[PDB]
């Protein structure tokens, strides 16, 4: 069933599983029309499909052309997400297909279940705790490839860079989730933290800076401070 807060370790066993976040699939800007009504303009989006054990990210870019002439786009976006995840699973060799797919929003359960009827042994599961994957579009290199896309496209990333050479997948996922929560709560401050020191760079083949183990502890501490702060600034504490 639903992932609770008494099964963190299940993410990092040897059963293949993917998370699927749809919060950046259908993205709009809301603006005024010449007549003074309101309209939306869609911008490119993405499905965030992540193996938490390996860091492999299947970033399916959703080009605005997919919405052309369609109605009820927020509803369609969930079914388009499920269609693309189903297509991804079918494209993988059997021994790479997931045993479980965890959706970050419960409204994805029925669309994905219906698209995966052909895969009765793949468990489709809800999240008792909301993830911070919406902030993926605050990662500059991911945002860049989405906004530059002129057609539908899948791009493969490792969201952990090379961290697994030094740390476990439990620790790497906690770091990723701590960074993503920072970026979601106060993007500018989080990004200031990550880049303040120009001698620490992002390798061409990486998403995050090349911190030493010691520098990661400082970074992680700074992100915790930010989240706690904002949580005061927000609730006045």
């Amino acid at each position: 069933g639903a992932m609770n807060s008494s099964n963190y370790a299940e993410l990092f066993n040897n059963d293949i599983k993917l998370f699927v976040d749809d919060t950046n699939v259908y993205r709009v800007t809301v603006h005024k029309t010449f007549e003074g009504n309101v309209a939306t303009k869609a911008i490119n989006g993405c499905i965030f499909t992540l193996n938490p054990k390996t860091g492999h990210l299947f970033l399916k870019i959703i080009h605005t052309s997919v919405w052309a002439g369609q109605k009820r786009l927020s509803q369609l976006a969930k079914w388009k997400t499920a269609e693309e995840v189903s297509a991804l699973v079918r494209s993988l060799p059997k021994e790479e297909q997931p045993k479980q797919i965890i959706v970050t929003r419960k409204a994805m359960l029925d669309p994905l279940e219906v698209h995966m009827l052909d895969f009765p042994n793949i468990a489709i599961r809800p999240t008792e705790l909301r993830l911070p994957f919406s902030a993926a579009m605050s990662i500059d290199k991911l945002s860049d490839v989405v906004m530059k896309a002129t057609e539908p496209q899948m791009v493969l990333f490792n969201i952990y860079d090379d961290w697994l050479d030094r740390i476990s997948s439990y620790t790497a996922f906690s770091r990723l989730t701590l960074l993503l929560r920072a970026l979601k709560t106060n993007e500018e401050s989080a990004k200031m933290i990550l880049l303040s020191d120009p001698t620490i760079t992002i390798k061409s083949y990486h998403l995050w800076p090349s911190f030493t183990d010691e520098q990661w502890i400082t970074i992680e501490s700074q992100m915790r401070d930010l989240i706690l702060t904002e949580y005061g600034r927000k609730y006045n504490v």
Binding site: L76, W79, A82, E83, P111, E113, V114, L117
Partner: protein, 300 residues
């Protein structure tokens, strides 16, 4: 007008005949039910005084044979049996009938309730749902499970209702996932009506039979079936106009007949609110919506 005689009434029992019921005391002189209207299926049902557990009963059509009831002290129930000796049967009934030891099926002449509840229900289809081919009548009770309930455990004693499952390959065409899930017309019209039921009369007949087993026996799987068959129609954007008008009449009489005190367990809040207020057919069930709003406004 036909008759279902009883050999005797050795245990105290509430006896139902269609929507009517009456109490018989232990060893009370009682020898059956007369004046049963020809042309309809009927159900004769039982709840023992000592064990209100297990309501059970028998669906039958007097045009198909001469049927009587006899208590079995070994199996502990009132059993229906067929009498093949037509002259023996006529003679038994007439004796009980000049001795007035039978109750009369108490139909008011204005009253179309039973017709309206069994309009599409045929014995031959009942006998395909309830498989016991050596008898012309069909036994049902409170505890019997449905074929679909068994997939989620004795197959011979099952209710073989048509399996309906909205998240199944049968219901969902490859490449029309969203379309078929949000608008079930394909599944209703092509798969079920054209494919399985052949026509809307057989569909309504199964729907009506499921309701009656839910109401008379508290059969939970029958209630599930009834609601699934309603929801499949209401969740279809494209339904023949005569089917919607007929469904509205069917449900009207079902809601009218339901005991007021059993609504809490026999009516599924989600299905009815969806069907009456969210579904494609939200505006197509005027009679049903009016009686539901005046009789069970709590549910909604």
């Amino acid at each position: 007008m036909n008759t279902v005689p009883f050999t005797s009434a050795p245990i105290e029992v509430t006896i139902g005949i269609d929507q009517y019921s009456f109490n018989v005391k232990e060893n009370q002189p009682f020898h059956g039910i007369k004046d049963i209207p020809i042309g309809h299926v009927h159900v004769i049902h039982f709840q023992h005084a000592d064990n209100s557990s297990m309501r059970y009963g028998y669906w039958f059509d007097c045009r198909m044979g001469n049927f009587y009831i006899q208590y079995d002290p070994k199996d502990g129930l009132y059993k229906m049996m067929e009498e093949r000796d037509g002259a023996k049967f006529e003679n038994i009934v007439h004796n009980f009938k000049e001795r007035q030891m039978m109750v009369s099926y108490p139909k008011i002449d204005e009253d179309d309730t039973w017709y309206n509840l069994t309009e599409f229900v045929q014995m031959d289809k009942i006998r395909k749902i309830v498989r016991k081919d050596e008898n012309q009548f069909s036994y049902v009770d409170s505890s019997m499970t449905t074929v679909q309930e068994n997939e989620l455990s004795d197959p011979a004693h099952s209710l073989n209702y048509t399996v309906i499952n909205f998240k199944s390959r049968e219901a969902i065409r490859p490449g029309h996932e969203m379309e078929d899930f949000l608008d079930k017309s394909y599944y209703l019209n092509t798969v079920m009506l054209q494919g399985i039921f052949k026509n809307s009369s057989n569909y309504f007949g199964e729907l009506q039979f499921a309701f009656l087993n839910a109401m008379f026996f508290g059969n939970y799987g029958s209630s599930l079936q009834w609601h699934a068959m309603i929801e499949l129609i209401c969740s279809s954007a494209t339904v023949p106009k005569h089917m919607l008008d007929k469904l509205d009449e069917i449900l009207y009489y079902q809601i009218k007949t339901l005991p007021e005190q059993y609504s809490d367990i026999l009516l599924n809040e989600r299905v009815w609110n969806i069907c009456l207020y969210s579904s494609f057919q939200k505006n197509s069930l005027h009679n049903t919506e009016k009686i539901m709003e005046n009789k069970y406004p709590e549910l909604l």
